Design a protein around this ligand. Structure first.
Ligand code: ADP
Ligand code: ADP
Ligand code: ADP
Ligand code: ADP
Ligand code: ADP
Ligand code: ADP
Lengths: 202, 202, 198, 203, 192, 203
C-alpha cells in the first residue's frame, strides 16, 4: 500500500509519514498552480478519483481506485465494498444547489469512504470545488478547529448539523485567492496528523 | 488552557501545534538526559502528574493537575470530574506484577484521563516506567502501528485484549537504551498528530 | 419547504395537524379507507398522500434524502425500492408476522416525514383484515411506544407486547378510529385539535 | 400518583391529561413573569431551579421542586444515578458561568443530572435564560432554534456540547426584558416537549 | 486443561449446592432482597469453585458492550439497592435490573441473582418465575436492554409468574433453565 | 417450524430441545469426519458452507443449507439485510484467501452475512478450518481460544478484526489430519454456542 516504503528504505512510521506528506503536498501545490484543478469534473466520483490520483499516485498503490477491503474509523463502519459502487452512483446524482444539499452530499461521500487511505484530504478539495461552483464560496479551513471538525465528522452520519455549522461560519467569497487554497491544504493535512511542511515552501 | 495561544497571540492552529510540540519535546529530552526520569515514583498518579507537569508546564494551564471539566473522545465519556480523585486513589492501589495487571492498570488510567490534555503522551512514559521496574522491559513504540494503537485504546474500556497483545509483542529488554526512548517519544507524539521535530535534535 | 409557505415551526405544527386531521376524517367518513390496498407500499403511499398533499410537495412519494432519528440511520435511499418490494412480499398471517412487517416498514421509513402517523393507519388496516382486530392506541403509553420503536430494529418484543395487549375487536367503531388518530398524533407532538370536531 | 390530575373530571386519556397539564403550568409560567416573581429567583443554583419547577408544576406533578428517587433514561441515555444526585447538584452549583462556553457546560451538566421526575426540559431552559441574562445580558430567542435540531443537540451534548452551543449562540438576543421573547419562548419550549394546544399569552 | 471439562465440573458441583440450598431449608432462612442475602446465595453455590465466592469483585467488568458499575461505587450502589422498594412488580423488576447493573461478583451474577429475584417475588407477590416459560434468547436480549428500559424483561417475567411458590419441581427445573441460559446443559439438578 | 423436532416430538422444555439438537447434529459432525465426506467439500465457497450446514442440521432446522428469509440480529448487531444476502455471498465467494489476513477477513465477512437462521457459528468454523488447511496447511486448535475471548472478538470483528486474528493466529496447529484436534474442536465449538451435554467422540 505504501509505495515509498521499499523504494526509500523507510522502516520508521514517522519518517514514512513525513515523506508522504512532502510528495503529496508537492502534487497538491501543482494541482492548483497548473490550473488543472479547474478542469476536473465537479461533484462526481470521477472528479474525486482524479483528485485522489493526482495527490497520491506513486504514494498509495491504487491511488484513484476504489478499495477492495472493508474499513472503519472509531466505531463507524464505512460503506461495504459489496455496494460501494452503488453508493457512488447515488452520490453522483445528489443535488448541490444550497449549503444543506452540498453538506449532505459531502457527508455521504465520507460515509462511502471509497479509497483505502487519503479520503479526508482528497474529499475536502472536492468539497471546496462544489462550494466554489454552486455558492461562489470556499472554506477558510483555519477557522474550523481540528477537534471540532473531527467530532463533527464522527457525528455526521447521524446528524450533519455540526459540520454544516462549522463550514457555514468559515465560508469566504475569496474563491480565486491562491493563499486561501494553500493555507487550507496545510490545515487540511494538519487535521490528519501531517504537520512537517508548508505547501508554499515546496 | 493553551497558554502559548493567549500569551504569544498565536492565531494559526498549525503554528500553535508546532510550537507546543517543540517546547514539550525540549522538556521531554531534558527529563531523560538530566536523569530526572529515574527519580520519579513509579505507577502512581503522583508520578504521572510529575511527568505531565515536566512536559507541559508553561504550555497547558494547570499542567500536572486534575481537570475540572468533563471530557470525551469519539463516543467515549471519560471518568466524571466529580469522581476523579477517588478513581485515581483506586488506580494507585491496583497491582502491577505481570503484563496482565500492568495493562489493566494502564487501561484504567487512560479511562481516568485525569488531565485536560496530554494524557496520551504522559501516560505512555508512565507505562514504560512500570514495565521497566516490574518486567525489565520497555515498549518499542515504532513496532506498534498508530492506527492499531488508537483503535486498541478505543476498544480497551470494553476489552483490553488488543492493546495487551500490541504491547506484549513490542516489548524490548533495552530498558536503558537512550535511542529506544527518544524514538519512542517521537512515535508517541506522532500518534497524537505532532510530526514536526525529532526530540533528540532539540 | 411546504405549499402553505409557513416558516414558523409552531405554526406549521398546528396547521399541519388541523389540515391533515381534516383529511383523515374524510378518509374515514368517505369510505375511501376501505378501498386501500392492505399491507403494501401502494396502500401506505395512498394514505400518506391523502393526509399530506395539501401541505408537502412530496406527499405519497419515496424520499430521496437519507434520514435518521435518535442514533438510528433508516434504510439507505439506494435500496429503498428493493426494501419496499421485500416488505410487499412479507407474510401477515398472524401477529408475529404482522408486527415483523410493521417493524420493517418503519425501518424503511419511506417518506420524508409523516411515517409514524401514516404507517399506524396502515398497520390497523392489516390487523383488521387478518386478525379482525385494531389497536386501541390510548392503551399504549406514548413513551412506552416511542422507546419500543427505537428498540424494534434489534428486537421487536417490546412493540409486539404493547400492540397485542391493546388489540380490540371493535374494528368498525368510528370512535376507536378517531381517538386513535388523536392519540397517534399525540405520540408525534401534535395536541391542539380533536379530529372528531373538524 | 406522579400525575396528580390523573383522575379529574374529563381527564379520560393521555391526550386530555397532556392538555390540562399544559394549561395549568402555562398559566403558572405567565404569572411567573408578569408578577415579577421571576426576577427574585436565585440565578444559577439548584435552589433556583427547584423554585421554577415548583412554581410551574406544584399541584400538577407530585413532588414538584423535589429531587427524584428513581433512576431515569431517555432514548439510549442513562441520566445521573440517584445515589449521587444530590452531590452532582452541589458540584453544578459551584461551576463557573462567566462566559458562554462555561454557561453551556453548566446547562449540559444540569440536563445530565435531570434532577426531577419530569419537567426537566422546560424548567431548566427558563433557568438557563436567567443565567445568560445575568452574565451576558442576553437571553435565548427559542423561536430561532428548531425543535428537532434542539433535541438532537441535547442527545449529543453529554459527549460534545458543540451542537447545542452553536444553536444557543446564534439565537442569543439582547432583548432581555422583552415580554414577547419570553412568552413566545415559553410556547416554543413546551412545543419541544409535545405540548401545543395553548398560547401562554392568552391564558 | 480443557475449557469444557472445567465448565462441566462447575455445573455439577454448583448445581449440587443449589439442591442442598433448597432441600436443607437454608434458602428459607436468608435475608430477602438485600446484598447480604444475595452474597449468601453466591457463596452457597460457588464456595468450592470461585475464589472469593460471595465477595464483591475488585476488578471492573463488562459484557457485550456494557460496562457494569465501576468498583469504586460498588459499595454505594449495593447500599442504594438495599433501600429500594419491592412492593409491586414494577419496583421488584427495577430493583432486579439495578442489581444486574451492579454485577457485584466476578462471575455467577446471573444464576445467583435469579434465585435472589424469585425470593423477592415470593415474599411480596406470592409468585415465582416458571423459568422455562422465558425463552433463553428473549431473556438475554431483555437483560441487555434493561439498563435503558426494563419493559422487555418485565413483560417476560410477568407472563411467566406462577403461584406454585413452594413447588419443589418448579424450583429445580428453574435451576436447570437458569444454568442453560448461561451455557451449562450437562446435568439435571434433581438427579444429583 | 424452525425447530423441526419441537412439534414432531412435542418437546416443550428448552433444555431438552437443546440437548437433543446437540446430540443429533454432533452425531452428524462425527460422521462428516469419519466417513471422509468432509474431504470432498468445496473449500471457501457458500456452496461448501451450505453443504456443511445441511449435513449437520437437515433433521433439526427446517431450512438447513438454505439462506434465511428474515432479518436477524445478535446483541446490538444487525446482520446483513436479507435483500442483500445474495450479493453479499457472491462477493464473499470472490474474496482471496492466500494468507491469514485474507482468510480472517473472509471469515469475518461470512459471519456478518450470517446466511442461515441458526447454526452460523458452528458451521462457519468448520468451513474456516478447511480454508486454513488448504491454504496455510494449518487448522485452529479451538481449545486454545477461551470462549469469552472468542465471543468478544467476534462482536468486535465487524469494526476491526485484529482481536479475532490474534486468537486464531496463536491457536494454529499443523496437525491438519489429527482426529483428536478435529473432534475436540467440535466439542469446544459447540461449547461456545451453549451446548455441553455430549462428547462428539462417543456418539
Ligand atoms: N468516526 C468517524 N466516522 C466517520 N467519519 C470519520 C470518523 N473519523 C474521521 N472521519 C472522517 O474520515 C476522514 C479520514 O479519512 P482517511 O481516508 O483516513 O483520510 P486521510 O488519509 O486524509 O487521513 C476524516 O478527515 C474525517 O472526515
Ligand atoms: N475513543 C477512545 N476511548 C478511549 N481512549 C481513547 C480513545 N481515543 C484515544 N484514546 C486514548 O486517549 C489518548 C489521547 O488523550 P489526550 O489527552 O488527547 O492526549 P494527547 O494530548 O497526548 O493527544 C490516546 O493516546 C489514546 O490512548
Ligand atoms: N430512534 C428510532 N429508531 C427507529 N424508529 C423510530 C425511532 N424513533 C421513532 N421511531 C419511529 O418513527 C416514527 C416517526 O417518524 P416520522 O417520519 O417523524 O413520523 P411523524 O412525521 O408522524 O412524526 C415514530 O412514530 C416511531 O414509529
Ligand atoms: N437522548 C437524550 N439524552 C439526553 N438529554 C435529552 C435526550 N433527549 C432529550 N433530552 C433533554 O431532556 C429534556 C426532557 O426532559 P423531561 O424531564 O422529559 O422534560 P419535559 O417534562 O419538559 O418534557 C429535553 O428538553 C432535552 O433537553
Ligand atoms: N450485554 C449485557 N448487559 C447487561 N447485562 C447482561 C448483558 N448480557 C447478559 N447480561 C446479564 O448478565 C448475566 C450473566 O452474568 P455472569 O456474571 O456471566 O453470570 P453467570 O456466571 O451465571 O453466567 C446474564 O444472566 C444476564 O442477566
Ligand atoms: N454481537 C455479535 N456480532 C457479530 N457476530 C456475533 C456476535 N455475537 C456472536 N457472533 C457470532 O455469531 C455466531 C453465532 O451465530 P449462530 O447462528 O447463533 O450460531 P450457533 O447456532 O452455532 O450458535 C457466534 O459463534 C459468533 O461467531
Amino acid at each position: 500500500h505504501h509505495m515509498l516504503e521499499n523504494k526509500l528504505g523507510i522502516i520508521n512510521q514517522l519518517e514514512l509519514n513525513r515523506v508522504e506528506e512532502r510528495v503529496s503536498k508537492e502534487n497538491a501545490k501543482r494541482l492548483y498552480d497548473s490550473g488543472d484543478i479547474d478542469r476536473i469534473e465537479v461533484g462526481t466520483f470521477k472528479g474525486l478519483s482524479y483528485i485522489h490520483n493526482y495527490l497520491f499516485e506513486d504514494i498509495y498503490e491504487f491511488a484513484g481506485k476504489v478499495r477492495s477491503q472493508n474499513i472503519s474509523k472509531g466505531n463507524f463502519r464505512f460503506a461495504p465494498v459489496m455496494y460501494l459502487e452503488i453508493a457512488l452512483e447515488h452520490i453522483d446524482k445528489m443535488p448541490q444547489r444550497n449549503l444543506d444539499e452540498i453538506v449532505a452530499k459531502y457527508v455521504e461521500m465520507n460515509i462511502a469512504h471509497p479509497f483505502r487511505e487519503g479520503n479526508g484530504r482528497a474529499t475536502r478539495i472536492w468539497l471546496d470545488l462544489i462550494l466554489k461552483k454552486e455558492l461562489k464560496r470556499v472554506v477558510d479551513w483555519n477557522l474550523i478547529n481540528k477537534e471540532d471538525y473531527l467530532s463533527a465528522m464522527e457525528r455526521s452520519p447521524v446528524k450533519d448539523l455540526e459540520i454544516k455549522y462549522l463550514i457555514s461560519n468559515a465560508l469566504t467569497d475569496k474563491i480565486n485567492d491562491r493563499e486561501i487554497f494553500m493555507k487550507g491544504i496545510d490545515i487540511s493535512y494538519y487535521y490528519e496528523g501531517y504537520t512537517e511542511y508548508n505547501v508554499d515552501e515546496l
